[PDB]
Symmetry: D3
Subunit: 219 residues, 6 copies
């Protein structure tokens, strides 16, 4: 059993306020173990640091495009922290485009990406990566349990949906755990996607076998 | 007086093959418009991009790689406009926004093609309009304007919000999101009205005006 | 027997009017088989699409240099179609310079090039590639049988010359199957070159053993 | 009349978090100064760069990779200034000297961050001042000026040679070497004097003036 | 009034070592010429490039890699001219044509070296003249002009066609092909006439004039 | 015993007047042998050619920065001569940044660097490379025997110090075989450094075992 997996690590999980060192350390260990039997690629988000800086740029009335560029820039500094945690198993530099990630995987090294272009999120970056690498699996480690019928941190009636088809995720994301564009990419290619939180992330070996309490999305 | 971004649909510039005289005309008009305003242009892929994408589809290429092929074709198309724009154009096809910005500083018309998988040239033009803080975004597509359907009806004016509903193709969602998020005044016209850009940018057109 | 081979696939063969899907598919299979025992690199031309677009640029009186750039751009879109046909065996992106092709070969992947610079053709690109990689063989798959004393599609007395030395090819190309610069490169390094048409291209395994009806050029 | 290079310490722009109003002010003043002189700016990393560097340290990352992380953070900081500088700034963060040179030709303020492992933004600003043959180099750090120690004393004026001794941190050695090697007139002031750049560049300041 | 491209032979700029005063002079004249015309320059490799190429030859390096070494040396030589051209030169060595184009827009003299294996700086200058639609191409080589042989004879005027025959070295074939294909007015002079470029570009010279 | 080694080959040794072909040939052989058992990376300096060209730029009163750029440019032409001598064992192009050197080492090829940035020397480039690659050893082959208490080509009392700690080298370089910045890098990471001349360079196998008459610097 040898699969190719893309992990989309949410910026808020990686950097809630300041970088969460314990989680970085722990997820790096997990990723490292999984990389022993599978080809692993990674995309990380911006988190609190990205929101601070973007908010500063907002006070100077900068364009929404320049603000995206700032967030992207912050996601790459974050990606560097994971690369550091992955030690010798990581590709040494933040990967900025898909074919470069492909190369890293050829060299049996783990490529870690940050954002790529204005208009979308690292979620979209992760989906396109998975699509490009023809990954068997896309694992989204976010700050919520899985996919709910409503925002679980707010709406009391929010119920978790264990399994859905890409179309379901599209409805839900429109009515969000995942960004729309990312949702469209997952739906156009039929990328098998798992959405889990920090708890399940503690054991990626089990997660990739389907043993988790998150949400599984597939055609 | 104005900073304008023109989004020329691929099917309009290259219906089957390249529409020679139309390219000559749009190039000429774009030139006149640039004497009075700052011009930037993004060109689509058209039928040619679909042919090449279909070929890759036959080899079960991933959707991401197909996007890259379409992008490559949109740049080939852009080179045709750059050629028609002669000395008033920025020599090479622009691949990123600040590059378009440098061209504007040099008083040269930058012509972009696509940029990244996942979206279309509309998104490119939208993000370009937004990056440059353009006053106007002109979308020249294969449809007469924005209809309430594919017996539909054409909506003269509407707000960014209403544009997001309708798109739920005429314009891709990402592009509609960029337009709403920033409130970019946008005009959607067909090949017919594109035959007189000079007047189109002054309200004289029978297309659709999307504005906050 | 492990050789390093550079294949120069003519644009007119790859795209006679529209892309010739059957030939692309077939040559990709052949290239794939040859790559099992040898290191394969590929360069492709522009064809009909390149002539259309270049001709459009001519109507706008653009420089001959800008027109070359357009042809190059079209050859890269063509190269992408072959990359697609080569599937997992191909280097994912159009290679734009020789050392990048070298890398692809290091990764046991097939690099596919398009044009590189104004002033010459993909033939020259292929010759320089072969020279750079120190290839044992340069195979030119064009739209003619091999090298003739005159244009075979026109002159009735055109006779095919089975074997010649680089000097011969130079005379012939001056008095063309191959572009002059490409001819000069083949002559300065003494690159063993085979010139065949579509028919012989159906079996590259046989072609590289010398079993073909084309022309062989070597010192 | 003058070509000036400003070196803004990371701790000054980002003490803990970004100092909003200070950024607004320095951005405003830099803008006024640019009406009369050619301006170029290099921004440091501050506390944020140290946090991120410390994290990498915890994973025993090499010193070279830590330098790369600090550099990445200095560019994030530079984007904040570029934002505050609005349309008078060069859009992207400048990564090499001739790039800064192009920005100057375009009458836009280039804002650089770090560039290479082994040194700091002071060296970047010094080499930038030198590359551009700038008339003045203004160093805005967290210290009042150049003291004979960390009861030390502040030295009003001194020569490049004497600056090399003192640094044997206020300013990194490589930067001091570049300043001496070329004889770049340099002014070292603190956050206090930075509150009125317009006068600082005219001698009115209580910092240190290093000059041959 | 005119857009001119100068092709300075490597042996002329670097006979054995760099010809200091000659570089100073050609740099000075190029500067004067640029006050009245748009100037672009391409520099060769000379004896130095041959030394380095010969060394690689000793290790049986491929001809392609030798070309890359010669190219690298031609850029080293170009940096010497850029240095002599001072503030009127584009800071970095130009590696591609549109880059030279940007320099021209900035009113700075771009100085290119070689660009691709397979040809020489003559081809680079020819393609540059062609890309820029230059009115004149001035070739400064080690020979007095274009002779009917290596008792030969010098041909005052000739047409592109006749230049292609003669080259079948003074000028490389690719360059001759570019000159003919486009009909670039070309002047071929030696180090002697290069001592007064200002007059050379006005017909006053005893070299050869290749023109359609 | 498999170590990772960075060799800093002084420009004056590689090019004393004109390129020293015999030394290039000989050191390439040595480097090639060492690369059979270890991961080898290389940085080379400018030498006489770099000083000539820099001096020409001085006569035109160019900035010290532009002069550095010229020296860097010359070091890369020099690096190409070594690459040529290393034949098939070398990475085909002059490496310009550390992660690219990392890649070359992944491909079991020898990367050869020239200068990288204004302000320092190839010595600093070598030290940062070693630091980046986490090399076990940095070997400096310069034009002097090892580290002396004074300039050995001038001061009669110059005595060679066989062993010292990074702090020692810092004092000495301040009061130079090695450039200050390079010295600071060696001291901040504690890079084990050996400083030898041409004589000892004739047998790198012995040098890396500690059998040499040069200077060894380590914490
Ligand atoms: O490819 C990319 C990545 C990131 N970004 C920009 O950087 C920011 C961070 O990128 P994230 O991927 O973390 O965005 P998110 O919106 O899902 O972030 P949170 O709300 O959960 O904090 C986003 O706000 C986006 O604008 C891009 O523009 N493009
Ligand atoms: O930024 C871009 C631009 C273009 N493309 C890719 O290139 C192709 C052409 O890009 P277009 O912008 O022309 O697409 P369109 O689908 O809107 O085209 P028509 O249907 O009217 O014919 C599209 O199919 C898209 O996938 C990208 O992936 N990214
Ligand atoms: O490296 C390159 C490749 C291609 N090109 C440019 O692109 C075009 C296509 O490149 P080809 O290699 O297909 O040219 P060809 O001349 O042998 O083409 P046909 O006549 O057989 O159709 C050529 O016309 C050339 O100008 C370059 O300028 N440089
Ligand atoms: O060119 C550069 C710039 C910066 N950096 C790296 O980025 C970091 C921040 O770069 P700074 O220029 O802010 O460093 P500083 O150490 O002088 O910072 P403070 O102590 O006052 O907080 C530094 O730690 C340095 O290693 C480089 O490696 N190279
Ligand atoms: O674009 C270029 C330029 C130069 N070169 C390579 O660099 C070298 C120097 O480039 P030159 O343009 O000086 O060559 P030249 O041969 O005409 O030189 P001389 O004989 O008069 O001494 C040449 O030997 C060539 O191979 C290229 O390969 N491509
Ligand atoms: O990374 C680099 C490398 C080199 N250089 C520049 O190129 C030149 C050659 O680089 P070297 O590394 O050979 O300098 P060196 O000072 O130790 O040279 P010698 O005195 O022994 O001859 C140096 O003078 C330097 O200015 C840089 O600026 N940066």
């Amino acid at each position: 059993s040898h699969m190719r997996i893309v992990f989309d690590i949410g910026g808020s999980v990686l950097v809630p306020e300041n970088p969460d060192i314990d989680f970085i350390k722990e997820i790096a260990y997990q990723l490292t173990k999984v990389s022993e039997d599978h080809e692993v690629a990674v995309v990380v988000g911006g988190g609190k640091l990205a929101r601070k800086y973007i908010e500063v740029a907002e006070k100077f009335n900068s364009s929404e495009t320049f603000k995206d560029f700032i967030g992207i820039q912050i996601t790459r500094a974050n990606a560097m922290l994971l690369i550091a945690a992955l030690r010798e198993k990581a590709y040494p530099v933040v990967v900025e485009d898909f074919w470069e990630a492909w190369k890293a995987v050829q060299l049996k090294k783990i490529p870690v990406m940050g954002g790529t272009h204005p208009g979308h999120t690292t979620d979209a970056v992760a989906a396109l990566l998975a699509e490009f690498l023809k990954a068997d699996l896309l694992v989204v480690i976010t700050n919520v349990d899985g996919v709910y019928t409503a925002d679980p941190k707010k709406d009391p009636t929010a119920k978790k949906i264990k399994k859905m088809k890409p179309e379901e995720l599209l409805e839900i994301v429109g009515k969000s755990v995942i960004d729309p564009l990312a949702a469209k990419i997952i739906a156009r290619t039929g990328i098998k996607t798992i959405v889990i939180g920090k708890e399940d992330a503690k054991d990626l070996f089990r997660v990739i076998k389907g043993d988790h309490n998150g949400t599984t999305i597939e055609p």
